[PDB]
Design a protein around this nucleic acid. Structure first.
Ligand code: K
Ligand code: MG
Ligand code: MG
Ligand code: MG
Ligand code: MG
Ligand code: MG
Ligand code: MG
Ligand code: MG
Ligand code: MG
Ligand code: MG
Ligand code: MG
Ligand code: MG
Ligand code: MG
Ligand code: MG
Ligand code: MG
Ligand code: MG
Ligand code: MG
Ligand code: NA
Ligand code: NA
Lengths: 197, 144, 227, 122, 54, 139, 66
RNA sequence: UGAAAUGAGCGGAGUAUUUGAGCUGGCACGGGCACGCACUCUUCUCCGUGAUGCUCCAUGUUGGCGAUGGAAAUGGGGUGCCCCCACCCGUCUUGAAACACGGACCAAGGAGUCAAACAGACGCGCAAGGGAGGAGAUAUGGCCAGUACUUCUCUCGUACUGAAAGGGAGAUGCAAAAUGCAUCUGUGGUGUGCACACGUCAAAUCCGUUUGAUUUGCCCAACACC
RNA sequence: UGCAAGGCCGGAAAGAAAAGAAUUAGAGGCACCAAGUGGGCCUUCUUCGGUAAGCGGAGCAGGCGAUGCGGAAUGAACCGC
RNA sequence: UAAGGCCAAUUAGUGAAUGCCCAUUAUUCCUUUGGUAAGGGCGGAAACGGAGAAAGUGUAGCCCUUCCGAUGUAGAUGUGGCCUGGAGGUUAGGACGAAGCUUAUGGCGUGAGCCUAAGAUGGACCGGCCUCUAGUGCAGAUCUUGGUUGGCGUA
C-alpha cells in the first residue's frame, strides 16, 4: 500500500453544475461556457463561474452604489474614452435615497421595474448578457460588480451571543424576555463587550 | 412528500441512524425546557444570556393605540410624492404638500440628505430634521 | 472553404517546423553526450595518477567525501511513529521499494539517521544512475506520471538551456551540479521491484548481517537486482 | 441481416450473488441482500465464504448489453414500431412483447421479414 | 444534542387531539365554500322577497 | 421569438416522440432520418429540415421544410416526388441544398430504401409462388 | 468509575493540525494600552486623515488640468 | 497479418564518416610525468512517407469437424464424483463457535408518522417594499368544494435606544455656535484585495498570438485598524 | 537639529553569495448546518499501591475494538503485510 | 555418518553479484469504478468498404486519449439507482386469451431487479414513459392470526 494519511482533507468542495430550473439560465450557461473555454479573457471565466452559484450567493446590488463607483472610476479617465459598461451577475434594485444619476449602460440578469425606469429616464441603457456577448465578446471596457452580503439578518445571528466579545443577536421572538442575568452587572454578571484577539 | 424522507433510505439498516450502544429512548433529558438551571445550564448560558430574572417597572393595562407613533426619515420623503410634482418642485417656488398622518406616519426624523424640497405636515419632528428641511427650502407644519 | 484552406496552409508550416526542431535537438544531444563522456574519462584518469604519485613517495590520498546518496525504503506501512512518518513523507518514500536521490550534506544526513531501520542507502555509480533514468524514469507533467520517451518532453518540462536531454539529467544527478534539486524535484519517485535473489534479514543492520542502514558503495549490487 | 462485429465477450463472473444461508430456509429468496450482522463471516470476508458484489465486477463498456447473437434488444408492440429500427438494423434486434396476441404477431413477423429487421423471438 | 435554537413555547399540553380516550377540542374549516355559496343564495332570495325596497 | 435552442431545452426529457424502452432512447418522429433522439435529427422542431421516404413502385421521395411557413402546419412540408431511377447522390444533393449537415445520412437512407424495395419484390414473388394451396376463406 | 487518561488526545489534536498563530499585523488593537500615548496618537491620526483628503483633491485637480 | 509498419530493424543513395586504443608537440601534478586541461589496429554512414482519416468495425497459412440433421459446435442449466478450502445465525459486550440470551416449518399482517413554533441549506416570484387572512362580487344560475376578480384594512420589514419620563443617526469646506454658516454628480480615512485600462519582463509559436510574472490607476465583494 | 508615535517623498535589494549551508505525492485563510461517541482493552519503554495476580492507578507511542490476508500446529492484541 | 545444538556456504582453493518454495505486498499487463482529475474533436473535406459524430453534472455514459485512488463497525451524504398501491398526462396491448400462479425457460444487469419462452395453467382486464401522492419493500420482536409438522402407531 501507499501511506496517504489524511489525503481526503485536501479535496475541495466546488460546484460544477447549476441547481436552477430556469431554461433561460441554462441557455446563458451554455453560451458562457463556450466563451470561457474558447477565449483567453478572464472576464468570461469569472462570469461563467458566477452564473453557476446559488441565489443566496448572488446578492443584489443598488443603483446608488453603481453610480458612486462609476463616478470614482471616471474622475481619473482621459475624458476621450467612453465609460465602461457596468456588469452585475444578479439583480439591480432602485434607491429612493438618490434622485439624480448620470447616464450609464448596465448589463444584468434582472432589473427592478423602478430601476429600469430610472436608468432609462436618466438617458442610460439596460442590457442582457446575450447583447453584451455581441457588443464585448471578450469583456473589454467593463466594470464587474458584486452586491453586499454583510448586513443580512442571518449573518447577524451567527455564533453564540453569550461568550465574551460577541455581538450576535439571539434567536428570540419576544424582545423583552432575555434582558436579565448574564446581560447586566446588577444581575449575576454581564457578558464582556470586548476581548483581545 | 413521504418518498423523499430519510426513512426510505434507512429501510434495511436496523438501527435507523441512532446507534447500537446508546439507543433511541423516550426522554433521556427530561421534557421541554427542563433543567435550564441544572444540567442544561451551559446551553442556556451560552446561547440565551439574560433569560432568568426580573427588570423594570410594570404597566398593568397596555394599550398600543395611544402609543402608535411610526417614523420616516428625510431622505425617504420621495416615497410620498407622486413623480409629476417631484420634478416640478424647486426651491423658492411652489412645493408639494405631504400629509404624514394620512400615509401612516407620525414623526419625521432627520437622517441623510433631502432630495426633493417640500412642505411636510406632521405630529412630531426632531430638531435636526426641522433645521435641515428649513435649510433645504421646505417647512414643517404641526398637525393633530 | 477559405477557413479550411488557411488551416491546411498553417498545418503544413507547423509540420516542417516540427521536423526542423527535431533535427536540431538531435545534434545538440549528440554534442553534449560526447562532452560528458570525455569529462568522466578524464576525471578518472586524473584520480588514478594522483593516487600513483602519492604511493610512490609513501604518502596517502584522501578521497573527496561523497556528494550524492541513493535511498530506498525496505519496510511496509504499519506501526510507524509520527516523527519517522513525517520524515519519510518529506523524503517522498511512501511505499515499499520507492527510491530517491538526495544530497549528502549535514541536514540530509541528520534526517536520514533518524529513520535508519526503514531504509537502505549508499553511494551510486554512473551506471546505476543511467539505468534508473533510462528504464525507470518518469516526469511530473501537468500533475501526471509520464514515462520518458524522447528529449523533447524533457526540454519542455524543464525550460532550461542546461537541461535538454537525458544525458543532461544524468550529469546533473551524478555530479551534484547546480540544478540537482530542479532535476530531482521534477521527477516522480522511482518505483522498483523486489530484489531478485532475496534479502538477508530485514530486521538487522547490514553490519550485523542484515539489510538496513548505510552499505556504502555496495548499494549498487543491491539495486542491480531491483532495476 | 448480420450484426456488426465487436470484441470478444468476457464475462468476469458467471455465477449469481446469492443470499447468505438461503439454502437452509425455504422462505428466503435467493436475491442478494447485504449482511449487516456484527459477527457475520460473509461481512468479515473469511477465506472460505461467499463473495459480495462490488464495482470491480463490472462489464467491459464496449460489449455491455450485447446478447449472444451480437444484437441489442429493443422491445416492440406493433407493426409501426418496426420503422424505428430500419436504419439501425445492424445494431438492434426486436423483441415482441409477451402479451401481443397471435393475430398481430403474424403481421409483425411478415413485415419484419420484408424489412430485414431481426427479431429475437419471432 | 440541542444546539443554538429558539426556546420553544408551543402551548399544546391540554387534551386537544381526538383519539381513543379523548373527544378533543378542534375546529376545521372544511365547510367554508359551501357556507359562502349558501350566504350568497340567501341574500339573492331575500332581495327578491323585499323588492323593490333596498 | 421562441428559438430552437429553447424548444429543445423544453422537450428534451419528455415528448410524445421520445420512446424510452429498456434503457434505450429512440424517436418516433416521422421527420427523423436516423431514429436518434438528438437535437440535430429532430425534424419536427428544427426551422429547416428534410427527410427521405419511399413511394409506390420503387420510388424515392424527399420532403422538405424550408423555414417560410413554420406557422402553417398544412403548408409546412412540401414534396419532391421523383421517378424510380434516382441516384442516391442526387437525393443527397437535394437534401444538402436545404441542410448541409444531413447529406451523409440522407445518402445512406436512400441506398437502404432501394435495397428494401428490391428485397420486397423478391419475397413477394416467393410468397405468391408458395401460395399454390387451397384456402377456405377470402376477403 | 472515575477514569482519567490522555491516551488518544494528541492523535485527535493533530488530525486537523495545530493551527499556527494569527500574524502580528492583524487584530492589532490598542484597547487597554497606557492612556496618554493613546490620546496623543488619536490626534495625530485625525490630522493625517485631513491631509489625505486634501491630497486627493489636489490630485483630481491636477489630472483635470492635464 | 500491414485498412496511414517512423524502424541501427522498412526503404533509397557510397565506401567514406568518426568512436576508442597505441604513438605524437603551453598550464596543471609530484620530488620526473603513471600520461589531466586547451589547440597502426579498431567500427558502417547520409536521406525519406501528416491525419481533406473526428470515432468505431471490417485483411494471413495448413489440417480436423460440419453437405440441413433425430447434425456439428460454443455458451448456459441439472445431478454425481475427485483434490483443496471452510466453526452457528441475530444480539449486548473490551472480548462469542461458546457450557451467554432468542431461534420446529409455511402463508398473510407488522415499527420515524400527522400538526404547530423557530432555524439553516437549496428552488421559485417580487423588491424598500413583500404578502395575506376573513369576507364580498359576478362568470355562476354532474360541470362548480375548482378557476377568474377585489377594496381599505392587518401583518412582517425600511431605526434604534432608555427601568422610565423621553429622545432619535449623510459628506465636504470655513469655523468653534451648550439648534453656527455655505455647497449637494456622491465611496469618512488607512492597509490587504476580482475584473478592466495603461506599460514592462520571461517563456514558447506560421510567428499573430498565447501561457505566466510584475508597475501604475480605479478598486467590486470581503477582512483588519481607526 | 535629541527621543516616542502616525504618515508622506526618495534609495537599495547576491530577493538572500561562499563556508556540508535544507526538504516536501509543499494552494493559504474564513464560515454555516448536523450525526455517532462520553463502559474500553492489549503491548513497548517509564513507573505508584500491593506478598503476588490473566490485580488496581498513571506517563509517551503503537495497536485491537472497526480487519481480513500470509506465518508462529492452535490463540482479538505476536511476526510479515 | 541427525531429520539435534553453535557457526558458515550456494553447486565449491575452478578461475568471478541471484540453490530452492509459499502472500489480497512489490513490478508489470488487461478490465471496472470514482476524481480538487488533465488534454483533444464536434461550421458534416470532396466523391460514393460500412456505420456513427448530442457544446454535454447524472443514461445504453456525445466521441477519443491520458494520470492517480479504491478494505471498514457507529455515523453522514449521492444516485436520468431498483421495487409496491392510487392521481394528472401521453403512448400501447387483450377471447388468435388480461391479472394471478408454476419452472434443469434462457437472455440482460457489479446489484436491487428487468425481459423473453413453455404451461398438456387461468378466464377479463392491463403494460411503458414524464410528473403528483402514500397506511410503499421483513428472517428473527418468549411478535399477531390461520394452517402444517418430527416425536408416534409411541406414552
Ligand atoms: K451476471
Ligand atoms: Mg452501516
Ligand atoms: Mg444518547
Ligand atoms: Mg452508556
Ligand atoms: Mg424588584
Ligand atoms: Mg527471509
Ligand atoms: Mg520489530
Ligand atoms: Mg455536539
Ligand atoms: Mg376505549
Ligand atoms: Mg455472535
Ligand atoms: Mg431592525
Ligand atoms: Mg463496541
Ligand atoms: Mg493485523
Ligand atoms: Mg475513468
Ligand atoms: Mg468503501
Ligand atoms: Mg407500514
Ligand atoms: Mg413473511
Ligand atoms: Na443594514
Ligand atoms: Na393505500
Amino acid at each position: 500500500g501507499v501511506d496517504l494519511t489524511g489525503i481526503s482533507k485536501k479535496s475541495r468542495v466546488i460546484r460544477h453544475h447549476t441547481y436552477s430550473t430556469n431554461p433561460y439560465i441554462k441557455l446563458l450557461i451554455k453560451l458562457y461556457k463556450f466563451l470561457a473555454k474558447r477565449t483567453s479573457s478572464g472576464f468570461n471565466k469569472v462570469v461563467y463561474q458566477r452564473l453557476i452559484k446559488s441565489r443566496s450567493n448572488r446578492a443584489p446590488i443598488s443603483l446608488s452604489r453603481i453610480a458612486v463607483v462609476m463616478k470614482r472610476k471616471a474622475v481619473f479617465t482621459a475624458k476621450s474614452k467612453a465609460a465602461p459598461i457596468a456588469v452585475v451577475v444578479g439583480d439591480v434594485l432602485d434607491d429612493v435615497r438618490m434622485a439624480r444619476i448620470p447616464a450609464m449602460r448596465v448589463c444584468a440578469l434582472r432589473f427592478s421595474k423602478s430601476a429600469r425606469q430610472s436608468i432609462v429616464a436618466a438617458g442610460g441603457e439596460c442590457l442582457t448578457f446575450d447583447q453584451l456577448a455581441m457588443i464585448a465578446p471578450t469583456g473589454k471596457n467593463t466594470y464587474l460588480l458584486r452586491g453586499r452580503k454583510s448586513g443580512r439578518e442571518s449573518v447577524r445571528h451567527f455564533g453564540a451571543s453569550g461568550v465574551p466579545g460577541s455581538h450576535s443577536k439571539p434567536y428570540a421572538t419576544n424582545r423583552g424576555k432575555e434582558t436579565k442575568r448574564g446581560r447586566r452587572t446588577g444581575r449575576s454578571y454581564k457578558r464582556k463587550a470586548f476581548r483581545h484577539v | 412528500p413521504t418518498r423523499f424522507k430519510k426513512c426510505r433510505h434507512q429501510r434495511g439498516s436496523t438501527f435507523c441512524g441512532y446507534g447500537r450502544v446508546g439507543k433511541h429512548r423516550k426522554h433521556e433529558s427530561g421534557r421541554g425546557n427542563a433543567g435550564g438551571m441544572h444540567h442544561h445550564r451551559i446551553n442556556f448560558d451560552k446561547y440565551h444570556p439574560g433569560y432568568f430574572g426580573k427588570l423594570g417597572m410594570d404597566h398593568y393595562h397596555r394599550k398600543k393605540n395611544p402609543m402608535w407613533k411610526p417614523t420616516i426619515n428625510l431622505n425617504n420623503l420621495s416615497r410620498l410624492i407622486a413623480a409629476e410634482e417631484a420634478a416640478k418642485a424647486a426651491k423658492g417656488g411652489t412645493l408639494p404638500v405631504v400629509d404624514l398622518q394620512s400615509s401612516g406616519y407620525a414623526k419625521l426624523l432627520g437622517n441623510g440628505h433631502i432630495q426633493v424640497p417640500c412642505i411636510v405636515k406632521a405630529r412630531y419632528v426632531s430638531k435636526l430634521a426641522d433645521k435641515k428641511i428649513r435649510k433645504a427650502g421646505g417647512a414643517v407644519v404641526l398637525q393633530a | 472553404a477559405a477557413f479550411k484552406q488557411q488551416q491546411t496552409e498553417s498545418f503544413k508550416k507547423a509540420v516542417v517546423a516540427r521536423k526542423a526542431a527535431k533535427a536540431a535537438l538531435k545534434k545538440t544531444a549528440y554534442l553534449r553526450a560526447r562532452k560528458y563522456s570525455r569529462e568522466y574519462r578524464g576525471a578518472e584518469k586524473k584520480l588514478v595518477t594522483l593516487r600513483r604519485q602519492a604511493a610512490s613517495h609513501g604518502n596517502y590520498y584522501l578521497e573527496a567525501k561523497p556528494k550524492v546518496a541513493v535511498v530506498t525504503r525496505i519496510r511496509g506501512i504499519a506501526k510507524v511513529n509520527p516523527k519517522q512518518r513525517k520524515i519519510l513523507q518529506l523524503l517522498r518514500l511512501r511505499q515499499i521499494f520507492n527510491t530517491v536521490f538526495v544530497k549528502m550534506n549535514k541536514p540530509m544526513e541528520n534526517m536520514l539517521r533518524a529513520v535508519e531501520p526503514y531504509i537502505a542507502y549508499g553511494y551510486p555509480s554512473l551506471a546505476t544512475v543511467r539505468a534508473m533514468v533510462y528504464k525507470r524514469g518518469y516526469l511530473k507533467i501537468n500533475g501526471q506520471r509520464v514515462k520518458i520517451t524522447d528529449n523533447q518532453m524533457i526540454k519542455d518540462k524543464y525550460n532550461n538551456v542546461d537541461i535538454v536531454c537525458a544525458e543532461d539529467m544524468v550529469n546533473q544527478i551524478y555530479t551534484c551540479g547546480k540544478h540537482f534539486r530542479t532535476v530531482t524535484h521534477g521527477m516522480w519517485p522511482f518505483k522498483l521491484a523486489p530484489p531478485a535473489g532475496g534479502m538477508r534479514q530485514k530486521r538487522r543492520h547490514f553490519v550485523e548481517g542484515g539489510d538496513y542502514g548505510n552499505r556504502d558503495t555496495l548499494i549498487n549490487r543491491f539495486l542491480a537486482r531491483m532495476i | 441481416v448480420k450484426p456488426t462485429v465487436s470484441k470478444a465477450i468476457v464475462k468476469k463472473r458467471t455465477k449469481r450473488f446469492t443470499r447468505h444461508r438461503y439454502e437452509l430456509f425455504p422462505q428466503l429468496s435467493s436475491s442478494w441482500r447485504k449482511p449487516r450482522g456484527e459477527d457475520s463471516p460473509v461481512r468479515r470476508r473469511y477465506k472460505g465464504q461467499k463473495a459480495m458484489p462490488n464495482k470491480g465486477y463490472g462489464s467491459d463498456r464496449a460489449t455491455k448489453y450485447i446478447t449472444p447473437s451480437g444484437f441489442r434488444n429493443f422491445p416492440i408492440n406493433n407493426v409501426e414500431d418496426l420503422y424505428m429500427l430500419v436504419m439501425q438494423n445492424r445494431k438492434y434486434a426486436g423483441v415482441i412483447s409477451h402479451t401481443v396476441g397471435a393475430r398481430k404477431r403474424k403481421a409483425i413477423v411478415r413485415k419484419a421479414m420484408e424489412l430485414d429487421v431481426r427479431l429475437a423471438n419471432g | 444534542p440541542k444546539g443554538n435554537n429558539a426556546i420553544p413555547h408551543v402551548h399544546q399540553k391540554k387534551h386537544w387531539n381526538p383519539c381513543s380516550s379523548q373527544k378533543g377540542n378542534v375546529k376545521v374549516f372544511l365547510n367554508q365554500p359551501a357556507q359562502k355559496h349558501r350566504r350568497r343564495r340567501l341574500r339573492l332570495l331575500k332581495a327578491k322577497k323585499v323588492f323593490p325596497r333596498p | 421569438s421562441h428559438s430552437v435552442d429553447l424548444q429543445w431545452v423544453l422537450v428534451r426529457q419528455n415528448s410524445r416522440f421520445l420512446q424510452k424502452r429498456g434503457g434505450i432512447r429512440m424517436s418516433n418522429d416521422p421527420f427523423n432520418n436516423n431514429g436518434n433522439w438528438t437535437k440535430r435529427h429532430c425534424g419536427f422542431l428544427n426551422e429547416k429540415a428534410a427527410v427521405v421516404k419511399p413511394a409506390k413502385g420503387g420510388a424515392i421521395c424527399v420532403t422538405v421544410k424550408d423555414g417560410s411557413s413554420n406557422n402553417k402546419p398544412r403548408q409546412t412540408y412540401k414534396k419532391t416526388v421523383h421517378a424510380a431511377g434516382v441516384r442516391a447522390s442526387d437525393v443527397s444533393r437535394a437534401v444538402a441544398a436545404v441542410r448541409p449537415d444531413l447529406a451523409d445520412v440522407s445518402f445512406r437512407r436512400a441506398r437502404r430504401m432501394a435495397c428494401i424495395a428490391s428485397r420486397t419484390a423478391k419475397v413477394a414473388a416467393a410468397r405468391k409462388a408458395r401460395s399454390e394451396k387451397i384456402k377456405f376463406s377470402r376477403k | 468509575s472515575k477514569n482519567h487518561t490522555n491516551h488518544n488526545q494528541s492523535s485527535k489534536n493533530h488530525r486537523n493540525g495545530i493551527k499556527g498563530p494569527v500574524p502580528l499585523h492583524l487584530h492589532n488593537s490598542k484597547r487597554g494600552s497606557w492612556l496618554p500615548a493613546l490620546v496623543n496618537a488619536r490626534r495625530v491620526r485625525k490630522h493625517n486623515q485631513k491631509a489625505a483628503l486634501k491630497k486627493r483633491r489636489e490630485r483630481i485637480a491636477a489630472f483635470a488640468a492635464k
